[PDB]
UniProtKB/Swiss-Prot annotation:
Belongs to the protein kinase superfamily. Tyr protein kinase family. EGF receptor subfamily. The active site is at residue 138. The modification N6-(2-hydroxyisobutyryl)lysine is found at residue 46. Changing residue 159 to R: Found in a lung cancer sample; somatic mutation; constitutively activated enzyme with strongly increased kinase activity; more sensitive to gefitinib than wild-type. The gene is EGFR. This is Epidermal growth factor receptor.
């Protein structure tokens, strides 16, 4: 369905402010001003580094069509693309930033129902990706964006088509990426939220992660988590990928807990 993806001319968007930058490229805050209309749309613009892959513009556009077909309230949808020497991707601006920064900045004013609702919404978005037979490969708290405080969206997937501390052991050892390896990354993401933005395996070099996982060590239990919540996180980190919970089960379990949030999370002033 080609109509779902707007082909943009360079004059229809302008870069205002830099939001993030790295080896992939740079994400700008900007405005989309379609020529015919009289509107200025807040957007995020990710410009990819030139000459990173041999894929021509024709093959890139076909992959972009898939990203534009993602229709789920908890997964970011590709709004437009600009194909010059560099590939530029346009999506809606998420004004509150990424969820990792949000929980760090508001760690004193976040209650149990907020945290459990985020866990539900992230599981809903990942379950949709699994329904579309799409593997994310880089699920993390930094890759969950906050549209409003109680509406989050998963971002930065399909860009892949090394985050060792978020990867399932089979991804580190065998480069295997499935929906069940996404579940491992979901467990680490939930761990980031329950610790209000702590770094996983803090103080341990990335090159040592596989050995400690093979020795049976895992991320420690967050203090606010009751045993019911931690055991769900621990099951996401089982060696047997098919023994890990499914995203559809995680939706049900975290939805049930969200009905009685103070029973499952113990938070000061909650
Ligand atoms: C006010 O808006 C924001 C601000 C801040 N800042 C606040 C604090 C700063 N200091 C003080 C700590 C640093 C951070 C972060 C985020 C957003 N909102 C946003 N909206 C939409 C996308 C997004 O969909 O981008 C795309 C676009 C096309 C294709 C794929 C992804 C993104 C986004 C996705 N991947 C990224 C990688 C790096 C940076 C941003 C993004 N972010
Ligand atoms: Cl808040
Ligand atoms: Cl960090």
């Amino acid at each position: 369905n080609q109509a779902l993806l707007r082909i943009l001319k360079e004059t229809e968007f302008k870069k205002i402010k830099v939001l993030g930058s790295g080896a992939f490229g740079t994400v700008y805050k900007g405005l989309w001003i379609p020529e015919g209309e009289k509107v200025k749309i807040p957007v995020a613009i990710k410009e990819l580094r030139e000459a990173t892959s041999p894929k021509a513009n024709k093959e890139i556009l076909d992959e972009a069509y898939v990203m534009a077909s993602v229709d789920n309230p908890h997964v970011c949808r590709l709004l437009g693309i600009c194909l010059t020497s560099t590939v530029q991707l346009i999506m809606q601006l998420m004004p509150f930033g990424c969820l990792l920064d949000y929980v760090r900045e508001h760690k004193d004013n976040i209650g149990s129902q907020y945290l459990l609702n985020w866990c539900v919404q992230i599981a809903k978005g990942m379950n949709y990706l699994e329904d579309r037979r799409l593997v994310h490969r880089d699920l993390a708290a930094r890759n969950v964006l906050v549209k409003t405080p109680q509406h989050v969206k998963i971002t930065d997937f399909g860009l892949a088509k090394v985050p060792i501390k978020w990867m399932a052991l089979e991804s580190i050892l065998h480069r295997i990426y499935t929906h069940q390896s996404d579940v491992w990354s979901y467990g680490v993401t939930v761990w980031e939220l329950m610790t209000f933005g702590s770094k996983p395996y803090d103080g341990i070099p990335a090159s040592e992660i596989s050995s400690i996982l093979e020795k049976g060590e895992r991320l420690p239990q967050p203090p606010i988590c009751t045993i019911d919540v931690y055991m769900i996180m621990r099951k996401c980190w089982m060696i047997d990928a098919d023994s890990r919970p499914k995203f559809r089960e995680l939706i049900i379990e975290f939805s049930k807990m969200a009905r009685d949030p103070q029973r499952y999370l113990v938070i000061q002033g909650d």
